[PDB]
Amino acid sequence: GSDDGTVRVWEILTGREVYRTTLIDDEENPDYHIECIEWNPDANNGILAVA
Amino acid sequence: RRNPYNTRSNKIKVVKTPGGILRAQHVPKCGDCGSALQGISTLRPRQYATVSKTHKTVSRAYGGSRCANCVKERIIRAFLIEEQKIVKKVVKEQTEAAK
Amino acid sequence: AREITDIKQFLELTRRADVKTATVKINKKLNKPFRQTKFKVRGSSSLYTLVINDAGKAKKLIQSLPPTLKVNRL
Amino acid sequence: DLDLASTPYKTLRYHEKAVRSVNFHKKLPLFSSAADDGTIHVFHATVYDDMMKNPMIVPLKKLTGHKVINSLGVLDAIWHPREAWLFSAGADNTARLWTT
Amino acid sequence: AKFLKAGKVAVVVRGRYAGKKVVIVKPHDEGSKSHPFGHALVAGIERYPLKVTKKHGAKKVAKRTKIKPFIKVVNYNHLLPTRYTLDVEAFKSVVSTETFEQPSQREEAKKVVKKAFEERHQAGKNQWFFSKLRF
RNA sequence: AGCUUAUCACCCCGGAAUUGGUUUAUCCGGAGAUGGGGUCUUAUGGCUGGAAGAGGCCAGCACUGCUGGCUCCGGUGCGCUUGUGACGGCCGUGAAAAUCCACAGGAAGGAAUAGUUUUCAUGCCAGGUCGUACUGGGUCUCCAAG
């Protein structure tokens, strides 16, 4: 997660930017931005929390 | 104690002793506005000799004796006095420009 | 008297070697009764008491006590 | 240490800038610290489950490669769930992954 | 007419900086998601330089001239605007909004402000600003 | 001794009067209320240590103490004593000192085989003398159950 308003997922070994998602349309907005992201520890769900 | 009188300095409280019987047991203001200073423990004056300065003093100018309300007032008053003194000096210079 | 939940602090206090004796107090309580126990040592400034609920923890603490420290029961 | 005392068991102060984050290893007995100076350090740490012995923590290696930008360094770092690999993130708009 | 500018001088009223002169580096009357209220970025001096005399040695003179600055967002309510002004383009960018709220970005800005203030005070100008307002 | 805990009071946004808030008692608000968000004064209560090993209430034997249980969970004021917090006014603006604490202040001192500061925590030593028995219509005084 970065301040560009886009969350990117990279493979651990290949390193390819397999998937992306945009959270804030105003990437340059200084009022707020992506603060933190965390994967759900529980398996079989694949839930990514994006703050 | 040896004092049997009801003087307010010798008042007594009732405490239930663990033995089941009842026994007799002996029991910061602002310098400008007079209001109690916030953040300062209301302990006995003699007990402050061991408390850390952090509890006794707040992190502010005049913190240990002012509530920060009159501090602002006196700062503003000093600034206004300085500005008027500058203005008074300007007036003096203007007057001297003619004499 | 003072109460501390730091097991290693209590062990260090016992390990000081400058304490003549220690005492372990057995207690009973319920929430399903349990055998609550307490560990107490004598300090220079104040008495230190440790609260222990699990029997295994009490046994481990007793084992950890150096042999040079006497443990009077109750 | 949750059993030693309220104060830290040991105090470490070596980074040239603010320590942004330190993360324990989920499985292996290792942990690493992240700081704004762009340098990552990894420390081995043994944690006795029940033995009445203090933990043994020692430094292992100084990791370099991050670029300090705007007085900032490794914003975040996470260890692999099962391997001795450490992911890293920095202000240089380039995340990194570290491997033995 | 507005009287708040990047060069305007103000005095902090509260926050341990009561009666401390500060320079308004960047007015932010419109606010932001953080600090929505009307506010401006300011920089100031926490420890005023001590008096210097010829009798003092070279080592003592350097210590006396040492100044410890401070930078933080403060409300207009606790700011006392002053007619005087000082140069601000030297460090306006360094003390920008993104500098605050995240170390160690504050340390470099504080060091830059300290260097600028030391250069401007010692063998410089604006002695009035680098003076202790005795209130 | 360790956690938790404040009516009042203070700070920020907000700008009321189409007049709102509220005490038993009616005073307050453009000199900033209703409303929303934060601060601490911690008296006093809640939990733990001291502490059940104490006291008390029972039970058996010795025949001179030991050996075994309970010592729990609540409700309540037209009853009474006391403390605390903000109030209503009266008119006499309202004892001193010792001791302790608080701040404007920036002279003084601070470095490379141990630079300064010790209001943080622990460890160490010491604190004399005087009275302490009883009693207490003809001196004073502290508690007053149903």
Distance CA A18, CA A37 (A): 17
Domain count, chain B: 2
Regarding whether B90 and B42 lie in a shared domain, the answer is: yes
Regarding whether B10 and B46 lie in a shared domain, the answer is: no
Residues of E in contact with A31 (CB under 8 A): 32-33
Under an 8 A CB cutoff, do B62 and E133 touch?
A: no
When computed from its CA atoms, the radius of gyration of chain D, rounded to whole angstroms, is 14
Domain count, chain E: 1
Residues listed for chain A:
51
- Structural contact between residues D77 and D23, judged by C-beta atoms closer than 8 angstroms: yes
Q: Which of D94, D92, D76, D82 is nearest to D40 (CA)?
A: D76
Q: Which of D43, D28, D97, D45 is nearest to D66 (CA)?
A: D97
Distance from residue B12's CA to nucleotide F82's C1', rounded to whole Å: 9
Tokens of A15: 């390193």
**Could you please report the per-residue DSSP string of B7-70?**
-GGG-EEEEE-TTSSEEEEE--B-SSS-PBPTTS----GGGGGTS-HHHHS-SSTTTTT--SHH
Tokens of A19: 């998937």
Regarding whether B86 and B43 lie in a shared domain, the answer is: yes
Under an 8 A CB cutoff, do C8 and D4 touch?
A: yes
Domain that residue B18 falls in: 1-27
Report domain extents, chain C. 1-74
Measured between alpha carbons, how far apart are the two ends of chain D, in Å? 29
- The alpha carbon of residue E33 is apart from the nearest alpha carbon of chain A, in Å, by 5
Regarding whether B32 and B75 lie in a shared domain, the answer is: yes
Tokens of D12: 């470490």
Residues of D in contact with C11 (CB under 8 A): 52
Beta-sheet strand order (sheet of D96-98): D74-79, D86-90, D96-98
Domain that residue E124 falls in: 1-135
Tokens of C62: 């007793």
